Amino acid sequence: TARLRDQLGTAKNANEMFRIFSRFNALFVRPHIRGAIREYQTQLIQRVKDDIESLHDKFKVQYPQSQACKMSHVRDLPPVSGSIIWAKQIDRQLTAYMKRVEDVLGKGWENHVEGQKLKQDGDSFRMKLNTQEIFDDWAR
Amino acid sequence: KLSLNRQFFDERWSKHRVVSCLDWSSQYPELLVASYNNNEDAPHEPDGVALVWNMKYKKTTPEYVFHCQSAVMSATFAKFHPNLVVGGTYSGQIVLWDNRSNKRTPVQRTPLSAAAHTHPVYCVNVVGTQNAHNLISISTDGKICSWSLDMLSHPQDSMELVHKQSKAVAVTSMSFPVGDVNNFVVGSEEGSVYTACRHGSKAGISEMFEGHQGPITGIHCHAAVGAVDFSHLFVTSSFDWTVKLWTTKNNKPLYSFEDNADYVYDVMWSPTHPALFACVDGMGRLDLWNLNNDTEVPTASISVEGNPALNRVRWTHSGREIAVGDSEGQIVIYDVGEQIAVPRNDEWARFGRTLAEI
């Protein structure tokens, strides 16, 4: 626990302490260690909520309206496959942030007080990110 | 003497409802949370209510309002989570309320499964230190569950309390020693207090106390800590018109008070004075007993206007004020005088001599 205080004694930006929780992830399975870290989990959960809000805002902008479509056409990627790639990248980032939340809160994050809303939003947003309709329409 | 300091009562929420539990916050000693069960005259209103009042302002409004579908018999503040209020309801759902959120409805509620409480819950309290705390909750079926405040979907630790012949202990109240987290005491409707262990090989009920001849309404351990350690002593109040001062060491009663002529409804120690304690009964009387001065008569006594049944009492952390709630949701606060509440340097030895003499 003294070393986990030296974490903030050394860490400066949020990415470094995210990586520190990633490296030390198993060590928080212990109950005393898990109870030691309480005030930093809220900070990183709020930062992940900010980031998934940014993802939501990016996804609000339609794909043709976004620079992704233009730069995909410029780089010879066809527009339907470009939209598919865009949706897949957003899905990948959503999964990465979900894994970040799991690492920060530890296992059993779906039932956490803050992780319930995150899990619900991730599930709904992943359902909305389903791309099979685009492929079906293009093939038809 | 006791001087009336303040009166709290809401026409919309607290009317025609009893007061089930009171609690003062450690971080906010001027914030008092009070529970209210369902109102028969208001079937359309929510059943359980929890109102948080304030003393630093003289405004009569409740500072915070919470409600939930099941009648709330217990409410308290989380010791190390100042924005949270934990309540125990009729169906056993251990509801939690965040004052930051605009929603009055509970943010979380435990399931009504066998792994959780499917019975009324009159005992919910947070125990531990800031780096390790747990929410202990006991139902009237004897099931005791230790939860984590950050996750109420399933209990961290949980089992059913039995003492002998696998007989269910229908706990009605509980208490913990000051600084202790593994041992605790429970008072059941059997009339028998049980000193029990939370976790370990001997986890469960350790000892049995015969004592009272009726259901226990309340039990409280010694809160004042100082020169002479009195943590082993506790007090109990039941429907048999008797208050009873006991200790863990002696299985038999140490002393009994029967000056009351009605159902004594709860009894609370003082957190500063080692000897002084108080009780409130069903004929409107709040009685302060100072064992150093007199183990024979109440040291002070007051009665609320109209004399309704006082259902619950609570001491402030400074010990200078006492709150009491009754059957119509009328909360009354009495300031206690300096010459009774404040313990001199020799009051601890006075209580030691009083205990030795008895």
Curated annotation (Swiss-Prot), chain A:
Changing residue 34 to C: In CMT2O and SMALED1; slight increased BICD2-binding. It comes from the Eukaryota. It is found in: Cytoplasm, Cytoskeleton. Belongs to the dynein heavy chain family. It is linked to Charcot-Marie-Tooth disease, axonal, type 2O: An axonal form of Charcot-Marie-Tooth disease, a disorder of the peripheral nervous system, characterized by progressive weakness and atrophy, initially of the peroneal muscles and later of the distal muscles of the arms. Charcot-Marie-Tooth disease is classified in two main groups on the basis of electrophysiologic properties and histopathology: primary peripheral demyelinating neuropathies (designated CMT1 when they are dominantly inherited) and primary peripheral axonal neuropathies (CMT2). Cortical dysplasia, complex, with other brain malformations 13: An autosomal dominant disorder characterized by global developmental delay with impaired intellectual development. Some patients show signs of peripheral neuropathy, such as abnormal gait and hyporeflexia. CDCBM13 is associated with variable neuronal migration defects resulting in cortical malformations. Homodimer. The cytoplasmic dynein 1 complex consists of two catalytic heavy chains (HCs) and a number of non-catalytic subunits presented by intermediate chains (ICs), light intermediate chains (LICs) and light chains (LCs); the composition seems to vary in respect to the IC, LIC and LC composition. The heavy chain homodimer serves as a scaffold for the probable homodimeric assembly of the respective non-catalytic subunits. The ICs and LICs bind directly to the HC dimer and dynein LCs assemble on the IC dimer. Interacts with DYNC1LI1; DYNC1LI1 and DYNC1LI2 bind mutually exclusive to DYNC1H1. Dynein heavy chains probably consist of an N-terminal stem (which binds cargo and interacts with other dynein components), and the head or motor domain. The motor contains six tandemly-linked AAA domains in the head, which form a ring. A stalk-like structure (formed by two of the coiled coil domains) protrudes between AAA 4 and AAA 5 and terminates in a microtubule-binding site. A seventh domain may also contribute to this ring; it is not clear whether the N-terminus or the C-terminus forms this extra domain. Cytoplasmic dynein 1 acts as a motor for the intracellular retrograde motility of vesicles and organelles along microtubules. Dynein has ATPase activity; the force-producing power stroke is thought to occur on release of ADP. Plays a role in mitotic spindle assembly and metaphase plate congression. This is Cytoplasmic dynein 1 heavy chain 1. The gene is DYNC1H1.
UniProtKB/Swiss-Prot annotation, chain B:
Keywords: Acetylation, Cytoplasm, Cytoskeleton, Disease variant, Dynein, Host-virus interaction, Intellectual disability, Microtubule, Motor protein, Phosphoprotein, Repeat, Transport, WD repeat. One of its GO terms (molecular function) is dynein light chain binding. WD repeats lie at residues 14-63, 67-107, 116-157, 166-206, 211-256, 259-299, 305-344. It comes from the Eukaryota. GO terms for cellular component: centrosome; cytoplasm; cytoplasmic dynein complex; cytosol; dynein complex; microtubule; vesicle. Pyrophosphorylation by 5-diphosphoinositol pentakisphosphate (5-IP7) promotes interaction with DCTN1. Serine pyrophosphorylation is achieved by Mg(2+)-dependent, but enzyme independent transfer of a beta-phosphate from a inositol pyrophosphate to a pre-phosphorylated serine residue. It is found in: Cytoplasm, Cytoskeleton; Cytoplasm. Its main location: cytoplasm. One of its GO terms (biological process) is microtubule-based movement. Homodimer. The cytoplasmic dynein 1 complex consists of two catalytic heavy chains (HCs) and a number of non-catalytic subunits presented by intermediate chains (ICs), light intermediate chains (LICs) and light chains (LCs); the composition seems to vary in respect to the IC, LIC and LC composition. The heavy chain homodimer serves as a scaffold for the probable homodimeric assembly of the respective non-catalytic subunits. The ICs and LICs bind directly to the HC dimer and the LCs assemble on the IC dimer. Interacts with DYNLT3. Interacts with DYNLT1. (Microbial infection) Interacts with human adenovirus 5 hexon protein; this interaction probably allows virus intracellular transport. It is linked to Neurodevelopmental disorder with microcephaly and structural brain anomalies: An autosomal recessive neurodevelopmental disorder characterized by global developmental delay, severe intellectual disability, microcephaly, dysmorphic facial features, and cerebral malformations including simplification of cerebral gyration, agenesis of the corpus callosum, and brainstem and white matter hypoplasia. Belongs to the dynein intermediate chain family. Acts as one of several non-catalytic accessory components of the cytoplasmic dynein 1 complex that are thought to be involved in linking dynein to cargos and to adapter proteins that regulate dynein function. Cytoplasmic dynein 1 acts as a motor for the intracellular retrograde motility of vesicles and organelles along microtubules. The intermediate chains mediate the binding of dynein to dynactin via its 150 kDa component (p150-glued) DCTN1. Involved in membrane-transport, such as Golgi apparatus, late endosomes and lysosomes. This is Cytoplasmic dynein 1 intermediate chain 2. It comes from Homo sapiens (Human). The chain holds residues 264 to 621 of 638 of the full protein.
